[PDB]
Amino acid sequence: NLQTFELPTEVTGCAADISLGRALIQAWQKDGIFQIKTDSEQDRKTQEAMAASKQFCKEPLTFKSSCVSDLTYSGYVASGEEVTAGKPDFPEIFTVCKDLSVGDQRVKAGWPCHGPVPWPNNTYQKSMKTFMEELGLAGERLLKLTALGFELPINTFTDLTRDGWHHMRVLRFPPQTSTLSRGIGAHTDYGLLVIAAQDDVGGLYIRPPVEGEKRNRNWLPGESSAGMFEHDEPWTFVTPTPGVWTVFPGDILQFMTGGQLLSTPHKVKLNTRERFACAYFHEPNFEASAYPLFEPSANERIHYGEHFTNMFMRCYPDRITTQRINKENRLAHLEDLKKYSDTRATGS
Template sequence: MGRALIDAWRRDGILQIAMAPRQQEVYERAQEASREFFAKPPALKAACVDSQSYAGYIASGEEITDGVADYSEIFTVTKDLPLDDPRVVNKWPCHGPCPWPDHGMRNSMKQYMEYLGESGEKLLRLTEYGLGVPEGSLTRLTQDGWHHLRVLRFPQRNKTNGKGKDGRGIGSHTDYGLLVIAAQDDIGGLFVRPQYDHEKFANWQKSSAGLHEDDDRWVYVPPQPGVFTVFPGDIMQYMTNSYLPSTPHKVGLNRRERYAFAYFHEPSFQAVARPLPGYEAGQKPHEGIHYGTHFTNMFLRNYPERITTQRMLAEDRYQKLAEPALRTMRSESVSEAINSQASVPMGARL
């Protein structure tokens, strides 16, 4: 089964897995909560923003892909941390509470993410088998993983399904982590672009946003009830030396409004990803990719005007990404990691 997963991703860029009955129930509740949230008045949605994390509401036109505003309306769920969490107190970039509109949405989305977290771990273990790497080569990175969710709504556009500029929901891009587990309603809009041998890209070095946006090699993914669509991200491509490329995809607008979820099964914010055994070929960066920095850079690029970006820059939070406490996968607690900085010479932290 692991080899079948690898073959499908290499051939088609995606694969689909059936939802278990319990997952289907949880998905439907999350879908209902999504519709209820996006139906709220604009002022109430706009109030769901946090200045420390990138969680919360993203208005249509706020997200930027390749310098162009996207039509999507989004609620992002990142790790939901209380204000007295040591990471928040110490001003770690992107760390903070999730500004939920109500308990109903909070409970629905957290349960949905918990189920997908279990699926993500199973998929990573199968991926290890399929790649022929030691057990734990991928799952060791996802201890305290920076898993997050994008709850999406796309407006209606008459007489289009992703055609032309008026049909663009989200521009072409690759996603930045290990695995993406997506679900869509019965209104289609997802397009993917399987790999072609002559094409090379490395989004962790140079953005692939907007790449091949208007060519004719995009494949429409018809909506199927009761399935998740799964594809690799940039970190997976780096760790496998492009044996598993990060799948380019984009979203078109359709004749009716559309709702979807994109769940990201990710390494720990503190993890440093390196090439897998047998897949080292001198790929850059040689020192590995620090996931926290990679994630932060993606969001800084996509949301240059967001209050979170402005506060991070004003308070020099970005500089903290170089500190040892943000680059460890040790088993010690976060508070111990933070306290241990006191014994580290300032020059060594950078």
């Protein structure tokens, strides 16, 4: 049974906030996950997003497949299209990344992954943006609490998330139809926090921290976490529960905390009925570099946008977005923007 916490609306650094931050860290260190209570508006926005997802998934495959972009990874992923650890995953997905028109300077500059969401319609757009605004408010609360729990300045993590590269996967898992039960293979996600919601069906499993168990650093090309531990216990079933979102760390928190927090491995198994879920990623700015918090002399860094881009290219090797990155050599822009960007997101 997972811990469930109610977060304060504002985090100021008072003793109660520090205490809550300590408890969140302890819950992640024991269970790998906790739940946060939703209020009526958070719940309403969650349910409206789930409803919009169900309606979109009923549309014809040709229409769903048209919701793609060769500039951004936002848009539709068919069942069987994404790859995890060399094997196809079976949800159909709509990914929402930062919604930037071709009038945005980063898009004009050809920055990888920057472009407009191919929304299926404007009611879907509004439902997802409203939900993501609420999710982001929670993400910022969680990051301030986490800083306080580690005895860090309250803004330590939020100083990296201004115009953060927040994104969301809006998922529908089919019922199991063959001998294959795999929904999504074991993996870790890539940013600071994952905040997730699900319907009543059930299928998400997470791996808690295991004493002595070494964890791959998924930001290194030589240590992908995809597939790791797939068939080894322990795996905790995330029981569907009304009125909560779940929260677990992503790769950036594992790196920055030197493993004091671990990016929680997780997987999804198909059930006897279709399953709707949404996974939200509260991320650094695309241009931000994560750094080790507890080793000031350590020179290792993670350029967040580079990690995102690498990951999405490995998930979607044949997507038009990936093809255009390769064709126009957009990973070069990525090394160039490190030194010549004029967004003022980083640097003097």
